[PDB]
Amino acid sequence: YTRVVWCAVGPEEQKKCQQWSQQSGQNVTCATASTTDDCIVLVLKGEADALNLDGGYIYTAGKCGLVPVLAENRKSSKHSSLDCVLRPTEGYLAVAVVKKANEGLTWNSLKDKKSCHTAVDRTAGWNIPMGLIVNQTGSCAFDEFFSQSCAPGADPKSRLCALCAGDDQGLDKCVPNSKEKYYGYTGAFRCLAEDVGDVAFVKNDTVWENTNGESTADWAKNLKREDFRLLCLDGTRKPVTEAQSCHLAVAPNHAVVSRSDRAAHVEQVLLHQQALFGKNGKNCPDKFCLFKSETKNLLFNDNTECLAKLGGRPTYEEYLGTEYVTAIANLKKCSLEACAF
Ligand SMILES: *[C@@H]1O[C@H](CO)[C@@H](O[C@@H]2O[C@H](CO)[C@@H](O)[C@H](O)[C@H]2NC(C)=O)[C@H](O)[C@H]1NC(C)=O
Ligand SMILES: *[C@@H]1O[C@H](CO)[C@@H](O[C@@H]2O[C@H](CO)[C@@H](O)[C@H](O)[C@H]2NC(C)=O)[C@H](O)[C@H]1NC(C)=O
Ligand SMILES: *[C@@H]1O[C@H](CO)[C@@H](O)[C@H](O)[C@H]1NC(C)=O
Ligand SMILES: O=C(O)c1cccc(O)c1
Ligand SMILES: [Fe+3]
Ligand SMILES: [Zn+2]
Ligand SMILES: [Zn+2]
């Protein structure tokens, strides 16, 4: 044991971390940086201990040595009262969502349309959908498939950042942090909701969480599921209730990673921290909840019930799985063994 420094990405997660910190009685402190790549860097340097990460990033971090420590576990499909902490994660569904009113749109007609991505390098928002698109077009010219996009983390002056909108003031356009309006699971679905884009690449959960009044935000409060459809790989369209059969891939749950050397200390600190701030936690809701950020998904997706332990003390390849790791490698051949820092 000792204090655990957490790395927050953006001023919003910075604000949330500071609060956790205050409430942990400086048991956990905070370090902020502008992007997840920067936070991976602070950790290698040793100035931060840990952060929660989407699989695509787990891949960046893993090549550099950081290991998965505990994974996100969302409300279980079935009646498993065998603990959340010990219950094996499920993997979330990666889907492609469109407006039902955009009638002729299918997977086979996405060329030249407008797209919304969570962020470059993420599983559902990028790696899954673009990996498939390169594969099918036998061409790495993926910066030219759609006519415009909001893919946070791309070049602000390129096609890919053309639909992004930055912050309140119109600044920080296309930055891969919550300051960019259309970044993340919620930011990319808002991009589609507002009709800035024709298609959004998010997880199944996102569609459900920002519709039928589950979100009281202004852009989403009037959104209904029937007004959306999913794009399957066979070319048909399906309601948002048929995710099970109409998804692009199943995705490894986001997971907390730290440097191998500090992984055990972080593991112990987090299990104790979720005991006071997790779901059914001691100080949640009363004082502070780690898994709540008014649907903004700050430091942890809002639908997390707990951070589970990983059975098999897996490496980042075993945790990300063999299927996915070769998908990310080939896709990345368009721009197989190196830590880029
Ligand atoms: C798609 O996402 C939603 C959101 O997480 C899932 O529905 C929740 O599912 C749990 C059980 O799996 C239920 O107890 C909740 O009542 C559901 N909430 C809503 C809004 O329905 C749904 O299970 C997911 N479906 C797939 C394909 O995984
Ligand atoms: C895109 O295609 C490549 C090549 O088909 C896939 O990589 C192959 O995947 C198979 C089984 O998944 C492996 O046995 C081979 O080792 C892979 N080939 C190579 C060159 O590594 C990749 O999985 C595909 N991407 C997506 C997103 O489906
Ligand atoms: C912080 O950690 C110390 C050492 O484990 C523990 O005794 C204490 O309960 C923790 N305090 C808070 C607020 O989490
Ligand atoms: O393939 C998955 O089912 C899966 C889902 C979650 C975590 C994980 O390592 C794997
Ligand atoms: Fe993700
Ligand atoms: Zn499947
Ligand atoms: Zn192993």
For the residues of 198-234, what is the DSSP string, one character each? SEEEEEHHHHHHTSTTS--STTTTT--GGGEEEE-TT
To the nearest 10°, the Cα dihedral for 299, 304, 308, 310?
-70
Residues 143 and 235 in one domain: yes
Q: 37: annotated binding-site residue? A: no
Is residue 339 in some structural domain?
no
Please tell me the number of the ligand nearest to residue 79's CA: 1
Q: Token pair of 244, please?
A: 């099970």
Q: 3: annotated binding-site residue? A: no
**CATH number, position 114:** 3.40.190.10
Q: Is 106 left (phi over 0), alpha (psi -120 to 50) or beta?
A: beta
**Phi, psi dihedrals of residue 212, rounded to the nearest 5°:** 50, 30
Residues 175 and 286 in one domain: no
Chain-centroid distance of CA 105 in Å reads 25
Residues 79 and 63 in one domain: no
- Residue pair 59/328 in contact by the 8 Å Cβ criterion: yes
Elucidation technique: X-ray
Residues 93 and 179 in one domain: yes
Q: DSSP character for 161?
A: G
Residues 153 and 206 in one domain: yes
- Residue pair 185/203 in contact by the 8 Å Cβ criterion: yes
Residues 27 and 90 in one domain: no
**DSSP per-residue codes, 10-42:** SHHHHHHHHHHHHHHTSSEEEEEESSHHHHHHH
For ligand 1, which residues put their CB under 6 angstroms from it? 75, 77, 93, 204-205, 208, 243-244, 303
Q: Ligand 2: which of 59, 128, 233, 326 to mutate, most ligand atoms within 8 Å of CB?
A: 326
Classify residue 313 as exposed, middle or buried by CB count within 10 Å of its CB (0-12, 13-18, 19+). exposed
Residues whose CB is less than 8 angstroms from the CB of residue 90 and which lie 6 or more positions away in sequence, other chains included: 73, 74, 76, 77, 253
Task: Provide the greatest CA pair distance for the chain.
Answer: 58
Residue nearest to atom 18 of ligand 2 (CA): 326
**H/E run at residue 134:** helix 128-137
Question: CA triplet 3, 6, 9: central angle to 5 degrees?
Answer: 165
Tell the residue number behind the tokens 């009262």, with chain if given: 81
Q: 79: annotated binding-site residue? A: no
Residues whose CB is less than 8 angstroms from the CB of residue 19 and which lie 6 or more positions away in sequence, other chains included: 288
Q: Token pair of 179, please?
A: 């300051």
Q: What is the gyration radius of the CA atoms in the chain, in angstroms?
A: 19
- Nearest-atom number in ligand 3 for the CA of 25 is 13
Q: How far is the CA of 177 from the centre of ligand 1 (A)?
A: 26
Q: 195: annotated binding-site residue? A: no
Is residue 154 in some structural domain?
yes
Residue nearest to atom 10 of ligand 4 (CA): 252
Q: DSSP character for 296?
A: S
Residues 122 and 11 in one domain: no
**Phi, psi dihedrals of residue 97, rounded to the nearest 5°:** -120, 135
Residue 263's nearest CA partner among 86, 57, 49, 87 is: 49
Residues 176 and 298 in one domain: no
Is residue 38 in some structural domain?
yes
Q: Token pair of 100, please?
A: 């039902």
Is residue 82 in some structural domain?
yes
For ligand 3, which residues put their CB under 6 angstroms from it? 1, 24-25, 27, 276
Is residue 179 in some structural domain?
yes
Residue nearest to atom 7 of ligand 4 (CA): 252
Residues 90 and 207 in one domain: yes
- Residue pair 204/220 in contact by the 8 Å Cβ criterion: no
Residues 231 and 97 in one domain: yes
Q: 254: annotated binding-site residue? A: yes
Residues 89 and 148 in one domain: yes
Number of folded domains that form the chain: 2
The pairing of strands 92-99 and 199-203 is antiparallel
Q: Is 253 left (phi over 0), alpha (psi -120 to 50) or beta?
A: beta
Q: Which 3 state secondary structure label does DSSP give 254?
A: coil
Distance CA(152)–CA(162), nearest Å, equals 10
Is residue 337 in some structural domain?
no
Resolution in A: 2.5
> From the CB of 310, is ligand 4 less than 6 Å away?
no
Residue 126's nearest CA partner among 166, 193, 184 is: 184
Is residue 199 in some structural domain?
yes
Residues 80 and 178 in one domain: yes
- Residue pair 182/116 in contact by the 8 Å Cβ criterion: yes
Q: Token pair of 109, please?
A: 């007609």
Domain membership of residue 241 as a residue range: 74-254+317-327
- Residue pair 311/304 in contact by the 8 Å Cβ criterion: no
Tell the residue number behind the tokens 């296309």, with chain if given: 174
Please tell me the number of the ligand nearest to residue 130's CA: 2
- Residue pair 273/288 in contact by the 8 Å Cβ criterion: no
Is residue 281 in some structural domain?
yes
E strands of the chain, at which residues?
Answer: 4-9, 28-33, 50-53, 66-74, 92-99, 114-117, 148-150, 199-203, 228-231, 237-238, 249-251, 255-259, 304-308
Q: How far is the CA of 208 from the centre of ligand 1 (A)?
A: 8
